[PDB]
Symmetry: C2
Subunit: 434 residues, 2 copies
């Protein structure tokens, strides 16, 4: 009987609190400059928040406590079936700094499954949504409505010591994490709310598998989709604090709003076109290209389509977000998953994504307008979901929403464990900058 | 007719765009330093965001395009009846930089009343809320659900010029502003959704009056509450960008989420105990003090209570601003309103708030820990709502929610008009500060 997640976390809290004390003695130490560029540039490049679980390496890409995507694919536990790392395990790692054992992960998956259920009022609330309501709005709303179940909100109202803030924060995070796939499934399946809302989960089986089950893609016939979904959810869990969904969650949480409310704010940010639409834009762009170039096509047809796009003044979606000298290692992980699956490699839409990734970087480099010409994770994700029958791009941010619960909830727990204060920058008007 | 609000705004957009260009030539100018204190201190004192409508003067308090609270009380238009400045007028002033005429305000009030109506699905959504759901959660959720009516979300989806982002943003802001009092009234009155949801508003009357009407406090017998409600909503509209409800709105809005979604995020922040509970805390504290000091007390009984509170390690809620060297001029405005009304002066609980404001500052100064020991607006607001029959403090943040739509929506419109980019600071881990 090995330590469970809460216990593992308690063990590493004291070293973090100590590290925090050491850093705090250097409060007065100067680490950067603020320029006008930063004030009017949405704080671009201004190092001004704390985030523990992930740091972007300029050469290796995103890393979780120093572990690369490849380190995680090897070290982190897998499901009962399949080849891919579990998001639960990624969560463990983000929270504790440590790789759980398989045994530990199975026990955590079991708790997640035991807390998956929803109050009747949430299902009633979802049933009131019109068909036209955007799925991200549905997801944000239903997550915020679960604040009726917040142990943190109740304990704060009863009186709670600051040193105890993290415990009910942790309990609400696990609860949110357990319920969010079922909420997402209900957004996917508006006509099945009563049944999907109360469908009993296989408690032996993992978080992604049970999400797949609530989407109507369970069983052994879908074990490759399960592996995809595990991988996707793991890869998208956390990417530093500066992205809007993470920052919004931190910010709202810093006023001591519970995690249901805080992540709802994160999801309202993720609903924003400049933040959660990249995977859809890419799939749309690839489909259009396929339509134009035809199903059987030549390296030249692709290469010259790219030139036509760039000479029009359009961007090539899914390329060049990064600072890296190579592809986003999250992209590479998705292509490594593909390489083992012959039916995916036989899909002409995937073949076009792959061809494009061998050709577009050189085109973008010659063209010279983007700082970095390499693919990011959004270049491959949409297509892989498309291949398994998720052919309505509008819902792809929903899946992103499920994944992006992991990192921001971890940071909330830590924010509370350390006692980080309310987030309060200082504003200035344009007249004031002169 | 004189120019309507939209037109007045278009006239001042080019000068702001020009001013923005002048500031942008100075991008490279250095205006501050970033310390470790700032990274671990929720960005405290880091001047890093833009906010146009309000700037805090260290001597005069909050100012709106350079106008004090007293400048606004004198210059700004009033209702058909009453003595107090209208929030609609304050909105005009925040948006345009200019005092509207009375005629202009009446025309804007008429539009607000004509757009107050709600879709059937929002009333169905509100009916699904359980009695236990916190009122702020209800308000945040219902505001986000109105994104079904967003002109900005639809226009972005169809394709829209970046220089035209502000127009649909403006239209969604006015629409939100028009509907939010009716949404708030429904949170106050869950048993009357049928009537309060569809009740036609008097178009000749102002925004606060019609809010009062939807709360079940319309008519001539309530003309003083109307004036209170006007004053309160005006005073709380905007207080720089750094507060959580403002910052969250800006932040989520910078990813181009529409104003319904963006202000919903603002309201999830306002639902945080560290941001929207101050009026409640103060009222609870004054009532407890009243109970303790008894029927017959002196200045010393009160003075001793203050010492007991501070020696316990507790704060005196409603006292102590971060910069300002006098009472908050928003407090003074609320006490000036009281002084005119004999009914309010006959309230024992009001008399105790006033006594405390003549005594506590000297006590807090002697004690020496509270940085500036003067009352702020939270010292007086709760009691004045209590006097007019709002006797469940749980709902006081809802009223705050209505008011705080004004400033953040103005800033969104400007963010879009100037083309401000997505808000994206840079995070760092604790190990990284070493």
């Amino acid at each position: 009987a090995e330590p469970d997640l809460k216990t593992a976390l308690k063990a590493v809290i004291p070293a973090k609190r100590e590290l925090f004390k050491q850093v705090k003695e250097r409060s007065d130490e100067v680490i950067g400059e603020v320029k006008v560029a930063n004030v009017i540039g949405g704080m671009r490049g201004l190092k001004s928040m704390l985030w523990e679980g992930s740091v972007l390496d300029p050469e290796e890409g995103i890393r979780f406590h120093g572990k690369t995507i490849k380190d995680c694919q090897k070290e982190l536990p897998k499901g009962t079936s399949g080849t891919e790392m579990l998001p639960e395990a990624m969560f463990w790692l983000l929270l504790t700094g440590q790789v759980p054992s398989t045994n530990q992960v199975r026990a955590f998956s079991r708790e997640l499954a035991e807390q998956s259920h929803l109050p009747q009022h949430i299902l009633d609330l979802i049933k009131s949504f019109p068909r036209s309501m955007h799925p991200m709005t549905q997801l944000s709303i239903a997550v915020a409505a679960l604040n009726t179940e917040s142990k943190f909100a109740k304990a704060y109202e009863k009186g709670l010591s600051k040193a105890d803030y993290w415990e009910p924060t942790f309990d609400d995070s696990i609860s949110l994490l357990a319920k969010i796939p079922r909420v997402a499934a209900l957004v996917f399946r508006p006509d099945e709310v009563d049944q999907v809302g109360t469908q009993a989960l296989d408690a032996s089986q993992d978080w992604s598998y049970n999400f797949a089950e609530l989407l109507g893609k369970g069983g052994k016939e879908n074990q490759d989709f399960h592996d995809l979904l595990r991988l996707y959810l793991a890869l998208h869990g956390d990417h530093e604090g500066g992205n809007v969904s993470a920052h919004a969650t931190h910010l709202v949480g810093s006023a001591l709003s519970d995690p249901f409310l805080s992540y709802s704010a994160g999801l309202l940010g993720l609903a924003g076109p400049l933040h959660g639409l990249a995977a859809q834009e890419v799939l749309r762009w690839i489909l259009a290209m396929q339509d134009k170039i035809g199903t059987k096509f030549t390296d030249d047809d692709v290469r010259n389509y790219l030139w036509d796009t760039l000479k029009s003044g359009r961007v090539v979606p899914g390329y060049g977000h990064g600072v890296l000298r190579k592809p986003d290692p999250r992209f590479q992980a998705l292509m490594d998953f593909a390489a083992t699956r012959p039916d995916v490699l036989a899909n002409p839409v995937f073949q076009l994504v792959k061809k494009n990734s061998e050709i577009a970087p050189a085109v973008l480099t010659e063209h010279g307008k983007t700082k970095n010409p390499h693919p990011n994770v959004d270049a491959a994700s949409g297509v892989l979901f498309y291949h398994y029958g998720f052919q309505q791009p509008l819902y792809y941010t929903v899946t992103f929403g499920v994944s992006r619960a992991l990192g921001p909830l971890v940071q909330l727990i830590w924010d509370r464990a350390l006692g980080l204060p309310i987030e309060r920058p200082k504003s200035i008007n344009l007249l004031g900058l002169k």
